[PDB]
Amino acid sequence: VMTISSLEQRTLNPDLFLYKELVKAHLGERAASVIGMLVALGRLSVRELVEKIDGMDVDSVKTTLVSLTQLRCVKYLQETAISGKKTTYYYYNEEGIHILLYSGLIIDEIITQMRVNDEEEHKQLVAEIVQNVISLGSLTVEDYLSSVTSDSMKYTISSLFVQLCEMGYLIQISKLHYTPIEDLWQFLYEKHYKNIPRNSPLSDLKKRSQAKMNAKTDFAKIINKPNELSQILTVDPKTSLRIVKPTVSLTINLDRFMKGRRSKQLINLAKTRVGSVTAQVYKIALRLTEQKSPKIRDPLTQTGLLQDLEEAKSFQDEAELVEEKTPGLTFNAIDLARHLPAELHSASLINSHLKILASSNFPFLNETKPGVYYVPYSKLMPVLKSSVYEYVIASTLGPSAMRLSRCIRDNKLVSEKIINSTALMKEKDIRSTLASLIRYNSVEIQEVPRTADRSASRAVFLFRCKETHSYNFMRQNLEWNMANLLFKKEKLKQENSTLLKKANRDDVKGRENELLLPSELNQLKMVNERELNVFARLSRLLSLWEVFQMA
Amino acid sequence: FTDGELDIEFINSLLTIVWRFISENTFPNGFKNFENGPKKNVFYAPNVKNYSTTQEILEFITAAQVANVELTPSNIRSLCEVLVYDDKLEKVTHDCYRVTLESILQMNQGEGEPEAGNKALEDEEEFSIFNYFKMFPASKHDKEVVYFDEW
Amino acid sequence: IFVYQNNITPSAMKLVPSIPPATIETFNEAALVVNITHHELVPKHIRLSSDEKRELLKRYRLKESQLPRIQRADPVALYLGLKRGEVVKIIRKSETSGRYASYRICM
Amino acid sequence: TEFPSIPLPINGPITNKERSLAVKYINFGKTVKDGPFYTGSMSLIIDQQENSKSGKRKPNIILDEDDTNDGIERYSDKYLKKRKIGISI
Amino acid sequence: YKGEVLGITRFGLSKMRDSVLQLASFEKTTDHLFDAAFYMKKDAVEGVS
DNA sequence: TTCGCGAAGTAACCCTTCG
DNA sequence: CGAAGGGTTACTTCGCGAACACAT
């Protein structure tokens, strides 16, 4: 009866609790009743979609999915059967609905990415371009430029099109990444067995060595095609500069900004790892290799459904193989990018102050060890999780929580007698903060016993970690807190809707000029005070949720 | 039996002397408390040679007047050395125990003066200790009250 | 149609529906020396066409459910070759009843 | 109730950066409830986007706009101030 | 009519009966109610039991 | 202190392929 | 061609019932 404490949905869903909510936040219930519905039973066609959502007929489940089609929120599979018609079988897109939660910080630090050249017009112009880019799903150049009505401002916008395309933020959206990747491999695998049905004495070696490896070398090339494929740009008599093709669509490319956010996380780590002067040159030597060869974040495009027999060693070996020599520019040299004019005492900057990052990998982790620039981003991710995960559990459960959670990582299957010799707890503070932590994971105990029904207590329950559970569980808990914060925002905007329809329609400049009587005007600065705090918590919570889903 | 008879009245106090001495071995004393001249690119690509403990630090702590008879730091030379491992000391090869992490988080905050200076640059980073004084008042529906739910 | 001579192996029928319009059979020379149709306990079975299948669904107002079902790997169904959804008409003969009929859907 | 703690929340919209991201979230949420932004829903929907739905409704994707859907509701400011017919709203 | 020669007892009755409370009165009244709520059975009541 | 079949649980052994 | 993995059939253990209703 005390329904304030959000007990109404404690066993609801962690995955439905965010996606349907983010769809409801921009359109409403008739669009949230399909992405929230296609996440609850899998893939589904249009004919078997109508009779379960309890709504209108095919004239409405088709219209609201077009609004999800031109927003890139679903995935379709155009395939036919052996005796049936051509079906649809729609999916749901994870990153295509992360874009709705993610767009504001996308544009707001693409501003800081594009801060380099000048000051005033570039910020406003990028905040006009990319804000309209992400609010649509796919737009062209000639359709945008039909509402400018200028001659030099249009020239500046046409320059900034290719200035954003050269960074790696605008690529041609093709069907080959608008298709589900779990079945795009199988389409490149069933015609490949159809390619060689040769009557010849070949064993099961054909199904592991020929078809698999040739599909690898025909798939890794074809996923890298949307990186740079729309490059001719040699239209001379129109403009005297590189002009983007008008009849060519553009999307956000979704992946370089992932890389920029994770590089920002690496710099935020390096501000605490090394000193104040080493992290600056580490930033200026790290924030230039994100635009050439993108494979840094991703759990790999092919590893989702074939890592079942033995291939994980091959995935790690191929990752560390193509992980080097592809960004292989000048590893430690000079560049005309930025030198941060400061003491960054050293009043001389060539080949003597730019060698301080050579002493940044031999200490505690930045991990560019072997020769010159080799392996900079492979052996951080199993510890970049473990560095941020300890700083959350220690800041929440207390300073003695990281003292117990890190000891068991050193020696798994640890007893309480030998953890007393390793820790310093008095008599019972070993087990008190253990029982305060056992309701959370990374405590997970294993039992020994060889008895009948626990007769003489057998000296049981020595503690392990099982660190692959607790990272996923922390990700679930953070994602639930994310979506619960957004539902606090939704209940706030749902509570007082009778004073919102007038406060934004005709009340712009005269809001302080006595248009509302002084009895409820403080509610207008109350519905804007802690609704600002919701988005501030969202901003400072994206910087902690997106570290537990690395490769 | 060198640790079972000391429960617990000066083990947490004994941490401070050895941590301050390793911080003195790895950093300057007075130049750590402030940011004026941050230790010269720290120690000019610092000090491959300088280790922490070999055969002298045990007798140094023994003769440091810790209000005890000079008996039984016998096996606390390495057990207390590995016992301080969480965010404080360094392991990499042998006796390379370094301090650098928490000398900014709690040294310049607890034993320091307060100022509302140029602190409008900390952007969503790893700040455990900071931002005390939970609510004033009543915890308006989006504060720290909800973490107990498992999910 | 394949006719075994002895005990089968588990790896023979591992891909039987692998051909999309066709299949293979599975027999045994031991239990095929006499056919079950001429036996006195089995009445006359005959398969109906697709046009005659929708006639009893109009006469009894039924559908592709709620019928007395017969299964695959049944000796009558393996003798006759009932694939799926094929109505077989049984012309069974009780003693004091006459020459009445019954219909069975194959599943 | 039950009092756990979160490290991050308090004393953090006083700076301009988190306020900038928050006000831009407000602006994105305010604009996103308008559908197509006065130039759209016409170009790229036939171009390999759900052929079974871009073929059955070739003139019927123009249902969402801000040129006519925000146009029809703005004609009624003048038909009511001069003429009155008794019809339910 | 089901397809196989089956029995009348507590495993021979569960071949056709989607009715749960009919099965939860014949034998094993405990196990038939715990299994029906696990599998989310609809149980449109039409039988005379 | 008792017969009835149906669930898991565990072992002997034969087919199939690898280098 | 010898050895390793996947999978069919065969030996052994538990539990659920044992009819209706009256007076104790």
From Swiss-Prot, chain A:
General function of this protein: DNA-dependent RNA polymerase catalyzes the transcription of DNA into RNA using the four ribonucleoside triphosphates as substrates. Specific core component of RNA polymerase III which synthesizes small RNAs, such as 5S rRNA and tRNAs.
Pfam families registered for this protein in UniProt: HTH_9, POLR3C_WHD, RNA_pol_Rpc82, RPC3_helical
Principal location listed in the UniProt entry: cytoplasm
Protein family (similarity comment): Belongs to the eukaryotic RPC3/POLR3C RNA polymerase subunit family.
Note in the entry: Present with 2520 molecules/cell in log phase SD medium.
BP-aspect Gene Ontology terms: termination of RNA polymerase III transcription; transcription by RNA polymerase III; transcription initiation at RNA polymerase III promoter; tRNA transcription by RNA polymerase III
Protein name from the UniProt record: DNA-directed RNA polymerase III subunit RPC3
InterPro entries found in the cross-reference section: POLR3C_WHD (IPR055207), RNA_pol_III_RPC82-rel_HTH (IPR013197), RNA_pol_III_Rpc82_C (IPR008806), RPC3 (IPR039748), WH-like_DNA-bd_sf (IPR036388)
Organism (species): Saccharomyces cerevisiae (strain ATCC 204508 / S288c)
UniProt entry tagged with the keyword Nuclease: no
UniProt keyword annotations, A-Z: Cytoplasm, DNA-directed RNA polymerase, Nucleus, Phosphoprotein, Transcription, Zinc
Gene Ontology cellular component list: cytoplasm; nucleoplasm; nucleus; RNA polymerase III complex
Localization, UniProt: Cytoplasm; Nucleus
Highest classification ranks of the organism: Eukaryota, Fungi, Dikarya, Ascomycota, Saccharomycotina
MF (Gene Ontology): single-stranded DNA binding
Curated annotation (Swiss-Prot), chain C:
UniProt superkingdom: Eukaryota
Compartments (UniProt record): Nucleus
Purpose of the protein: DNA-dependent RNA polymerases catalyze the transcription of DNA into RNA using the four ribonucleoside triphosphates as substrates. Common component of RNA polymerases I, II and III which synthesize ribosomal RNA precursors, mRNA precursors and many functional non-coding RNAs, and small RNAs, such as 5S rRNA and tRNAs, respectively. Pol II is the central component of the basal RNA polymerase II transcription machinery. RNA polymerase complexes are composed of mobile elements that move relative to each other.
Family as reported in the entry's similarity comment: Belongs to the archaeal Rpo5/eukaryotic RPB5 RNA polymerase subunit family.
Quaternary structure, from the entry: Component of the RNA polymerase I (Pol I), RNA polymerase II (Pol II) and RNA polymerase III (Pol III) complexes. Component of the RNA polymerase I (Pol I) complex consisting of 14 subunits: RPA135, RPA190, RPC40, RPA14, RPB5, RPO26, RPA43, RPB8, RPA12, RPB10, RPC19, RPC10, RPA49 and RPA34. The complex is composed of a horseshoe-shaped core containing ten subunits (RPA135, RPA190, RPB5, RPO26, RPB8, RPB10, RPC10, RPA12, RPC19 and RPC40) where RPA135 and RPA190 form the DNA-binding cleft.
Protein name: DNA-directed RNA polymerases I, II, and III subunit RPABC1
Gene name for this UniProt entry: RPB5
Full protein stretch here: 109 to 215 of 215
Curated annotation (Swiss-Prot), chain D:
Cellular location(s): Nucleus
Signal peptide: none
Further comment: The acidic domain is essential for its function.
Function as written in the Swiss-Prot or TrEMBL entry: DNA-dependent RNA polymerase catalyzes the transcription of DNA into RNA using the four ribonucleoside triphosphates as substrates. Specific peripheric component of RNA polymerase III which synthesizes small RNAs, such as 5S rRNA and tRNAs. C31 is involved in the formation of the initiation complex.
Family, as annotated: Belongs to the eukaryotic RPC7 RNA polymerase subunit family.
Subunit structure and binding partners: Component of the RNA polymerase III (Pol III) complex consisting of 17 subunits.
Protein name: DNA-directed RNA polymerase III subunit RPC7
Species, as recorded: Saccharomyces cerevisiae (strain ATCC 204508 / S288c) (Baker's yeast)
Residues of the full protein shown: 34 to 122 of 251
Curated annotation (Swiss-Prot), chain E:
Subcellular location: Nucleus
Cystine crosslinks: none
Domain of life, source organism: Eukaryota
Job of this protein: DNA-dependent RNA polymerase catalyzes the transcription of DNA into RNA using the four ribonucleoside triphosphates as substrates. Largest and catalytic core component of RNA polymerase III which synthesizes small RNAs, such as 5S rRNA and tRNAs. Forms the polymerase active center together with the second largest subunit. A single-stranded DNA template strand of the promoter is positioned within the central active site cleft of Pol III.
Family membership noted in the UniProt record: Belongs to the RNA polymerase beta' chain family.
Note: Present with 6020 molecules/cell in log phase SD medium.
Subunit description: Component of the RNA polymerase III (Pol III) complex consisting of 17 subunits.
Annotated protein name in UniProt: DNA-directed RNA polymerase III subunit RPC1
Source organism of this protein record: Saccharomyces cerevisiae (strain ATCC 204508 / S288c)
